[PDB]
């Protein structure tokens, strides 16, 4: 009857929708796995625990002199030691060459900050006592703004930095 016919027709089409749903979600999983096998995956933070003492990071070791923060570690590779703190970034500016692979090693002496580079996929949380490590190659020279996008106290809306990519 009407009700019983409707119920059978509804469940029949619902089975089709659920198979289609599964198929679509599987295609998204394949397209995500593709990103993980390209250069675009270097913005995923390193899974390794790299512990540091936030009380001494401004006094001793690689964050203590911002003017020696940019270190050549490879023929076309630079490692940059970045401090995110209440409320700014050091060095400022960060100066790097176009076309090289940049390894950012970011930490905090105080609270959690964000490190979001406008125009890029660099978008990483910065935890005190931990090093956030991400990799990016800048294709275009010019000035890129760093935005703090994790609430870090009353100075948060003013916490900006600068990357200068040199030809």
């Amino acid at each position: 009857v009407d009700e019983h016919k409707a119920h059978k027709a509804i469940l029949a089409y619902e089975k089709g929708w659920l198979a289609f749903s599964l198929a679509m979600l599987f295609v998204f999983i394949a397209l995500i796995a593709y990103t993980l096998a390209t250069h675009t995956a270097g913005v995923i933070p390193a899974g390794k625990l790299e512990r540091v003492d936030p009380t001494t990071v401004r006094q001793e070791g690689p964050w203590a002199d911002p003017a020696q923060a940019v270190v050549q570690t490879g023929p076309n590779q630079y490692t940059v030691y970045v401090l995110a703190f209440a409320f700014g970034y050091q060095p400022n500016p960060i100066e790097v060459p176009q076309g090289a692979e940049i390894v950012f090693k970011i930490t905090s002496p105080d609270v959690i900050h964000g490190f979001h580079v406008e125009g890029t996929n660099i978008n990483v949380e910065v935890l005190p006592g931990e090093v956030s490590t991400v990799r990016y190659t800048f294709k275009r020279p010019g000035e890129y703004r760093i935005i703090c996008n994790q609430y870090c106290g009353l100075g948060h809306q003013n916490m900006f930095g600068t990357i200068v990519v040199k030809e």
């Binding site: 409707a6 027709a9 509804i10 089409y13 929708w17 679509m24 990103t35 675009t40 996929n121």
Partner: protein, 31 residues
């Protein structure tokens, strides 16, 4: 057939696809 219910899941499917492929494109443009 539940033609009306089919029209709703078509609109839902197109909304998912525009969101997801639009941001996938953005991700490569920024990469």
């Amino acid at each position: 057939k539940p033609k009306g219910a089919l029209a709703v899941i078509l609109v839902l499917t197109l909304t998912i696809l525009v969101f997801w492929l639009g941001v996938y494109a953005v991700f490569f443009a920024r990469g």
